[PDB]
Structure 1
Amino acid sequence: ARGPKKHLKRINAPKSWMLNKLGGIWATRPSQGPHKLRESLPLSVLLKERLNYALNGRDVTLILNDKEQNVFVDGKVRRDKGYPTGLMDVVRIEKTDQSFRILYDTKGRFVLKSLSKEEAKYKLLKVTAKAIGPNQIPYIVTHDSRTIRFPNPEIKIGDTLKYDLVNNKIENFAHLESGNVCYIQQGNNIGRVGIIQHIEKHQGSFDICHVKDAKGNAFATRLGNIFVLGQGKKSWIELPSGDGVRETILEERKRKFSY
């Protein structure tokens, strides 16, 4: 192909953005950042269609360009129409001191969870890779594309850390092993939260995992899609749509219109 793509089509932009089909023809294309294209929510989407603080396109252009700084992502200022806010992030709306979790539904739509000045401090990080680099030093990396220097050594590659944004400090981690709580970042099963049952590795190039939860449903997904929302039953963050558990179309009806 000519070179590298550079736009994005209304029609082609992820169902996670709950986008306007009739809308236009395009859609703000996520900027190369911390999260992958599909797994992200560009700010313009976050304020216009989400919060609804903005509206028309120029509305954003003001907000992120205005010399006041109205948007914060993980304790930092952002002024990019399409910064890819990803899973388990913390976004603050300066002018109102609003704090949000970037989390998927139970139906897989990006949801905004309101946090208390309390959780707004800690953010959950999942461990990408772990190896030693320059001059005998250990480095850990998080999905959030965080690069960590001198990390606690009791941390295996597929771990989950709790991060104190305020001090850029770590605390209480927890690997994925039979008996923990987890969130699935993507898949025919995303947005779910349950107890890890067991992890059968097949090495041939793809390991799998099982899970249980509230109504004790059986879940199946690939490791790469498991995010440890916590150690031993206690979750670490407040979940959207009540608990991370979806209902039969049948259970939804009976709960709402009670059929």
Structure 2
Amino acid sequence: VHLRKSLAPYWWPIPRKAGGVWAVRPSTGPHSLEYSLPLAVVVRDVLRYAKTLREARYIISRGYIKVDGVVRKDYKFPIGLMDVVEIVPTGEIYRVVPDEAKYYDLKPIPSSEAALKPLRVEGKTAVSGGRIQLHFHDGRNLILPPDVGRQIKTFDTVVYDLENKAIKTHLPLRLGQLAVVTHGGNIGFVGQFFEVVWTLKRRQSVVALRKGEEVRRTILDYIMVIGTEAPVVKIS
């Protein structure tokens, strides 16, 4: 399967005309094609550690790159929102976070919050045994007992332990929390949740965010709760 350079996502940090007629195509990983960047692009463009595609594949082939605690040796692995990228031989850590300019950015983070990942609940399914399965914004799943999974509704953000496969902290979606817009024109904006026009489809509800006193509006689908007045993990 190919990806023409014209059909590449608009926000990717690559020149549109100059270059080849091809772009590296992500291999159906834990994100969406429109909202993910392949690992070889990050190693060559965003970190500039490789000057060619073979050099980027060589760096990835050694297992030097760790993505969310798992060494990825696939150069077409997709990276997306709230993912933790760690470079082993240099010890630097980044969290791909919603950016006001690049639309998605590699921000350095402290080593303590490297195992933590904030995940937005995209939905729940009832599985065998009566347990509940949670689906997150990057396709990741987590099966829970029925009573604990009853109190986690959709669009709630949960801080997930990659190290323990557990839920550190559950952040319900209520009016008055700190949210970051994760898609759309108003990307990168972090503000208080203070207004909602509940539509018939909840995913299409109009939501307003405030930062004293710049007010931006989006739909309810495009905002992730990052907690109260203090963001739980460094995003900006």
Map of 1:170-181 to 2, 5 A cutoff? Answer: 170-181=167-178
Q: Which is higher, the Rg of structure 1 or of structure 2?
A: 1
Moved more, 8-17 or 170-179: 8-17
The answer as to whether partners of 2:179 and 2:224 remain within 8 angstroms in 1 is: yes
Shift of 1:108: 4.3
Instruction: Point out 4+ residue stretches in structure 1 off by more than 4 angstroms.
Output: none
- The residue number in structure 1 matching 2:141 is 147
**Equivalence for 1:79:** 73
Q: Give me the CA root mean square deviation.
A: 1.6
Does structure 1 conserve the Cα–Cα contact (< 8 Å) formed by 2:157 and 2:224? yes
Q: Secondary structure at the match of 1:31?
A: coil
Matched, 1:28 2:24: yes
Matching residue of 1:19? 14
- Equivalent AA in structure 2 for residue 95 of structure 1: P
Distance 1:216 1:18 in 2: 31
AA of the residue aligned to 2:43: L
Residue 221 of structure 2: aligned partner: 224
Distance 1:45 1:53 in 2: 10
For the residues of structure 2 that align with 1:236 and 1:135, how far apart are their CA atoms? 33
1:209 correspondence with 2:203: no
Identity, in percent, stands at 33
Is 2:188 aligned against 1:194?
Answer: no
Alpha-carbon distance in 2 for matches of 1:181, 1:30 = 32
CA offsets, 1:82-138, max 9 Å, x none? Answer: 211110010111111221101121124321111111110211111011132112112
Q: CA deviation at 1:219?
A: 1.1
Match of 2:156 among 155, 159, 183: 159
Q: 1:46 aligns with which of 21, 42, 52?
A: 42
State the aligned residue count.
231
8 Å CA contact 1:177, 1:198 repeated in 2? no
| TM-score, structure 1 as length reference | 0.84
Determine the structure 2 residue equivalent to 1:119. 113
181-190 vs 15-24, which moves further: 15-24
Partner of 2:89: 95
AA aligned to 2:27 is S
Measured in 1, the distance between the counterparts of 2:8 and 2:233 equals 28
Where does the alignment leave 5 or more consecutive residues of structure 2 unmatched? none
Deviates more, 1:11-20 or 1:43-52: 11-20
